[PDB]
Amino acid sequence: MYLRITNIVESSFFTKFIIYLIVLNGITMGLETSKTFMQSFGVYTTLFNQIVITIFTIEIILRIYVHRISFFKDPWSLFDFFVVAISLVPTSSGFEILRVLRVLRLFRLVTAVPQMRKIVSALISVIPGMLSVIALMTLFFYIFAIMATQLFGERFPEWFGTLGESFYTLFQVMTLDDWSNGIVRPLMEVYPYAWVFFIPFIFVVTFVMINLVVAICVD
Amino acid sequence: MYLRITNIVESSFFTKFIIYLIVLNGITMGLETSKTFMQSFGVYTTLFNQIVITIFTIEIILRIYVHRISFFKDPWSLFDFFVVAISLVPTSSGFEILRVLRVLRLFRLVTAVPQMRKIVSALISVIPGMLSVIALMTLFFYIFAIMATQLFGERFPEWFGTLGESFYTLFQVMTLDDWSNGIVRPLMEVYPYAWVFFIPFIFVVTFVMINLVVAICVD
Amino acid sequence: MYLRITNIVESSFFTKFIIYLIVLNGITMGLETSKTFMQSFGVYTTLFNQIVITIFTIEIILRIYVHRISFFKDPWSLFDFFVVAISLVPTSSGFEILRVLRVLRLFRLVTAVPQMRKIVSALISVIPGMLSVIALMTLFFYIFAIMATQLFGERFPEWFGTLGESFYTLFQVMTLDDWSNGIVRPLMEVYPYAWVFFIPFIFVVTFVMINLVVAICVD
Amino acid sequence: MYLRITNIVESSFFTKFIIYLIVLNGITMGLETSKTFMQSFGVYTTLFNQIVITIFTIEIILRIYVHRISFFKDPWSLFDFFVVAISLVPTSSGFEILRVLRVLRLFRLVTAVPQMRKIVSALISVIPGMLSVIALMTLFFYIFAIMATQLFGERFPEWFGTLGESFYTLFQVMTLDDWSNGIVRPLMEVYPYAWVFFIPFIFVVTFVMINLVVAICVD
Ligand SMILES: [Ca+2]
Ligand SMILES: [Ca+2]
Ligand SMILES: [Ca+2]
Ligand SMILES: [Ca+2]
Ligand SMILES: [Ca+2]
């Protein structure tokens, strides 16, 4: 019976039947957004949802016999596994992000369809070459996040009052979002020299960021 | 009579006469902006407008005899047909954007002059090699846009209340426009963890965009 | 006497003397900023200024005899002419920008010291290959600017009320500066679909600019 | 005894021991942020802190016998010296940023661990090739900084009232942060033409910046 199902699993029909369901459950997840629609056909789509969820566990079950160990060394398969597992946690208890995390299954459209996998893989592959930079920056953030917390966090606890808070604010300065009128012009009303902290911070972080982009256009 | 007009249409005089009208109507459209001007010479330039619009239909009519099916497979020609047709719809009824969309005819200065044609084409050609990235993103946007609507849309209906609104807000976060003091700091007053949703969103979306820029700087 | 002064002008000492003055008059111009400083040495500097201005007219007079027509075909020299010329208009009558435009003479530090000339020329040389794009864009801005004046200028006359106003607002949207909370969210409170105008605008204009960056990074 | 210690200093165990303390003292500094933690184990940490600071001086002392002059010609060694030196100035007196500047020792993780040194060096090496442009720009900022102080500083002293202030505001316009609604639209309410100063400013500065990015993506 092994080869019987191994022929079902590897079938073009099977994979295309899956891709057909993702597009249906996705279209249907956009509809669950409408408070109007849920009042009409909510029950329609709640069942349809649970239906697809079963089909998806069946597939993942079927897919596992055919591949066994090979399956748990496949990124795309591991994913699919975890994205359905999430979709299995009972519509109750614990946290309700799990209810919301269910929409992550539409990323199976990324998994089930090549070229997407290609493009995704293409992107991801660029990350290891960046890890030296990324490491560098996080040390840098961490160092400044600490200084800022202990330099501005007393008078300005919304923005720098906590280590995590400083992280957030520093990220925001880095994205250059309302950084001057929003954060630093205020700070200087109390700490005239704060510009001495943030302009060097900005150069460095934008510089590094420019290099990183340049590194991705070398490789 | 065919070759007679085929020698009128293909003539340098004809083309340069058309180009002369575009720059003229275009100048006249900048003038129709002034409430002062319209109070003095508005009559002058409405008639001038109808005149050029005739001339352009006459031309487009002529151009079709000389090319027939060759014409409705020309991107640039199809355009002018459409753009002139818009300018034909009666200054009345339906909507008024049809009155406003008339100014689109000044894009004929792009159509009727090479180098422009070249430059535009150079740009457009870059698009197909982006469709794999672009597709990826729209899946991504759609996914998060749904998540956001069900996570933040009840308390924050102006921003995330409806799917389309989440799209709009997510776009804005992506252009990095006032994203922290404008949207996420507010969000955190109610949902402390909202940063867990938007910082990852930012990295991904900005990363992908960096890749796409690098992709265009390879090909 | 021609070769006597052709040996004075072309002298290393002559040039290095000029360069010495630029740095001095520049230093002295940063000091005329202080209302404090002007109250104690204001006169010291006003005369020092008039002095250097003569020395510069003398040089330009000298430089012209040694070069005649060769001079008025030199970008860098023409510059210093027009720049020194500005500084000759009397501290009175007309406009007072002319008084302010005097500090443009510090650009002579660029003109009279090589390597700067290199980099400046390096930069400038890139412009011709952008003229097709720069033209393309200005046509684009112009068409949208007209559309916006007639679509939003009645309710929103500060931002779109005049052809020039629309230009400015459009520029700002393009630099992506406070474009959504600042301009488009307001607009949508009256014109729900305004997003149909501004999102495509952003794509095109940002796209084009990505290409322009890619174009420069090829040539 | 020289070669005895030269074999101590050059030992892998030595370097690794140093790297251990950095990560430990660095972990300790993140905790020194917590107002809670300090009440609990603040003392525990301040002693451990001074301990590490002792150890680090010993190392730097040792490191010098083994390298002498070779050391004070090493960028990375000079740093470690200058950084440990900062941490040596007593917890009292003068400026208390010195207490804060202590956390700069976590940059020793950059110093003691290669790959980091590599990446830093990679970044730093790009700088010399930018000095012509950076010089160009600072002259540019300086000239505009002066014009602005004398053009807008009377009515708008917060933003332009002083040379340094103009510097700050101009930097902010350059980062394109809230530049239009935050600064120039205001300006224009009084000085209608301020746009003639700031749009050209923006073009130039953004142009130059794009060149510098491309310039790096070549070398
Ligand atoms: Ca920005
Ligand atoms: Ca704001
Ligand atoms: Ca901004
Ligand atoms: Ca803003
Ligand atoms: Ca505000």
**Contact status of D151 with chain C (Cβ, < 8 Å):** yes
What are the DSSP calls for chain A, one per residue? -HHHHHHHHT-HHHHHHHHHHHHHHHHHHHHTT-HHHHHHHHHHHHHHHHHHHHHHHHHHHHHHHHHGGGGGG-HHHHHHHHHHHHTTS-SSSS-SHHHHHGGGGGGHHHHHSTTHHHHHHHHHTTSGGGHHHHHHHHHHHHHHHHHHHHHHTTT-HHHHSSHHHHHHHHHHHHTTSSHIIIIIHHHHHH-GGGHHHHHHHHHHHHHHHHHHHHHHTT-
CB C86 within 8 A of CB C58: no
The gap from C-alpha A34 to its chain's centroid, in whole angstroms, comes to: 24
CB D93 within 8 A of CB A129: no
Q: For residue D182, which residues of chain C lie inside 8 Å, CB to CB? A: 178
Q: Is D75 helix (H, G, I), strand (E, B) or coil?
A: helix
The gap from C-alpha B105 to its chain's centroid, in whole angstroms, comes to: 12
Smallest CA–CA distance from B103 into chain C, residue: C143
- CA–CA dist B96, B98 (Å, integer): 5
- CA–CA dist D190, D199 (Å, integer): 17
A104, B163: Cβ pair inside 8 Å? no
- CA–CA dist A99, A89 (Å, integer): 8
Cβ-proximal residues to A153 (8 Å cutoff; 6+ apart), any chain: A160, A161, A162, A165, A166
Interface test with A, best of D36, D49, D99, D103 (most A CBs within 10 A): D103
- Closest alpha carbon to C172 in C208, C133, C146, C198: C198
- CA–CA dist A124, A131 (Å, integer): 12
The coordinates were experimentally obtained by: X-ray
Of D101, D118, D175, the CB nearest to A176: D175
CA of A180 to the centre of ligand 2 (A): 10
CA of B63 to the centre of ligand 4 (A): 50
CB A147 within 8 A of CB D100: yes
- CA–CA dist A74, A49 (Å, integer): 26
**Contact status of A213 with chain B (Cβ, < 8 Å):** yes
The answer to whether the Cα torsion of B19, B20, B25, B27 is positive or negative is positive
- CA–CA dist C27, C197 (Å, integer): 49
What are the angstrom distances between the C-alpha of C114 and each of C15, C75, C117, C122?
11, 14, 5, 12
Domains of chain A by range and CATH?
1-114 (1.20.120.350), 115-219 (1.10.287.70)
CB A76 within 8 A of CB A117: yes
Min distance C133 CA to chain B CA atoms (Å): 7
**Contact status of B116 with chain C (Cβ, < 8 Å):** yes
A143, D106: Cβ pair inside 8 Å? yes
Of B34, B171, B217, the CB nearest to C199: B171
- Closest alpha carbon to D172 in C175, C100, A140, A167: C175
